[PDB]
């Protein structure tokens, strides 16, 4: 185990002790069934990896200073232009949708086409070019899941800040740093009642 | 509207039917002294008429050239155009009481069946038990369905005597 969700409890027993990221947090008992156990495990890691990429892109674009994550999917509504890293790209909404569908379809299909199940979670090989999975893999996976869970929570944070505060995540961060006791989720006017 | 049936409120014949009908009673009131019971009575008939010939129109009762209120049966027409109080709503009211009477009757019949001589509790009705089953028919629809979804409302076809074919 990596710890305990509530220090002093013991309720989770279906969860294997070797499961990467096993903090023993299953309040609704969704992992009892071994097939659902495997599916949820694969879904969690996938969600984590995507969220980690999304979080890097959402803030990364702001860091470099080419716009915020929310402003990215708007040009097509206004019939503007796509621009990656500032450099322009000659595409449009329908073509991007089509190219995305086919790519994601051929890739995700193959990943699910896998039967070993463990590979579906950790394929390695071509997916392990630097081959850092030679040792300490059992703990590096904990880092992958822990950072991934944090990434998923952070992604929700970006959406919530934009939903209530409206300002960009970096801007909202500075607002709190500049006025911590004044600017917060408590004073956004959406988090608290009415 | 509906089938050329004008609303009684806008029905001129309906208005004339009032004028001429109250005149026919205000001519029978004259041949009587102002205080006589005959006259107190004819004045009540004139008031009751003037109230009815208005309660009807206020209920939006469409009437034809005859000036006599007509009723709409189609649920869609009655509901869509606010004519539900006529026929439509009354329909369920009768059905509820009708089924209530029938259900209470079968409850009693099936209780006296078995009991000693069931034939002598049909002539000399057991008023006590008959009075303990009347209110049981209030929720008859709930109980009747529970019997359909349990196969107890009807009898097996191999237990009902049938005439030779």
């Amino acid at each position: 185990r990596a710890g305990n969700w509530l220090p002093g409890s013991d309720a989770p027993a279906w969860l294997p002790d070797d499961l990467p990221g096993n903090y023993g947090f299953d309040p609704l008992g969704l992992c009892k069934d071994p097939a659902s156990l495997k599916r949820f495990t694969e879904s969690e890691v996938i969600h984590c990896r995507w969220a980690m990429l999304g979080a890097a892109g959402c803030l990364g674009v702001e860091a470099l200073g080419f716009g915020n994550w929310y402003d990215a999917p708007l040009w097509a509504i206004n019939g503007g232009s796509p621009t990656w890293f500032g450099i322009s790209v000659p595409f449009d909404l329908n073509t991007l949708l089509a190219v995305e569908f086919v790519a994601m379809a051929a890739a995700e299909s193959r990943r699910g086409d896998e039967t070993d199940a463990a590979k579906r979670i950790y394929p390695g090989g071509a997916f392990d070019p630097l081959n850092f999975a030679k040792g300490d893999i059992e703990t590096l996976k904990l880092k992958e899941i822990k950072n991934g869970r944090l990434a998923m929570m952070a992604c929700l944070g970006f959406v919530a800040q934009h939903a209530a505060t409206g300002k960009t995540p970096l801007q909202a961060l500075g607002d709190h740093i500049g006025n911590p006791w004044g600017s917060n989720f408590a004073t956004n006017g959406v988090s608290l009642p009415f | 509207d509906i089938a050329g049936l004008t609303p009684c409120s806008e029905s001129a014949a309906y208005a004339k039917r009032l004028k001429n009908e109250v005149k026919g009673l205000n001519k029978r009131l004259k041949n009587y002294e102002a205080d006589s019971a005959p006259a107190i009575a004819l004045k009540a008939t004139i008031e009751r008429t003037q109230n009815r010939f208005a309660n009807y129109a206020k209920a939006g009762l469409l009437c034809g050239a005859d000036g006599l209120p007509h009723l709409i049966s189609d649920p869609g027409l009655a509901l869509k155009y606010g004519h539900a109080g006529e026929v439509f709503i009354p329909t369920f009211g009768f059905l509820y009481v009708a089924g209530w009477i029938g259900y209470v009757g079968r409850l009693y019949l099936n209780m006296v069946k078995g009991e000693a001589k069931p034939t002598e509790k049909e002539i000399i009705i057991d008023v006590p038990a008959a009075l303990r089953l009347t209110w049981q028919g209030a929720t008859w629809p709930v109980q009747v369905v529970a019997e359909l979804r349990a196969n107890t409302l009807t009898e097996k076809a191999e237990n009902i005597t049938i005439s030779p074919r």
């Binding site: - | 191999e158 237990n159 005597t161 030779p164």
Partner: protein, 61 residues
Amino acid sequence: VGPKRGSQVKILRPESYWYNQTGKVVSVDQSGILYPVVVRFETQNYAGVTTNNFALDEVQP
């Protein structure tokens, strides 16, 4: 031979007022009498008779 005295048997005779209906076996003549099972019925036929001797095959407990 025949349903036990007192046993209720469903009448199977087609032209019987008590067909598909049940009745108590008053007796069963243990001779070769064609119809031996005497069956009594609370209900009475149109004539007014409330009983009838049915054959063993005409009765089913």
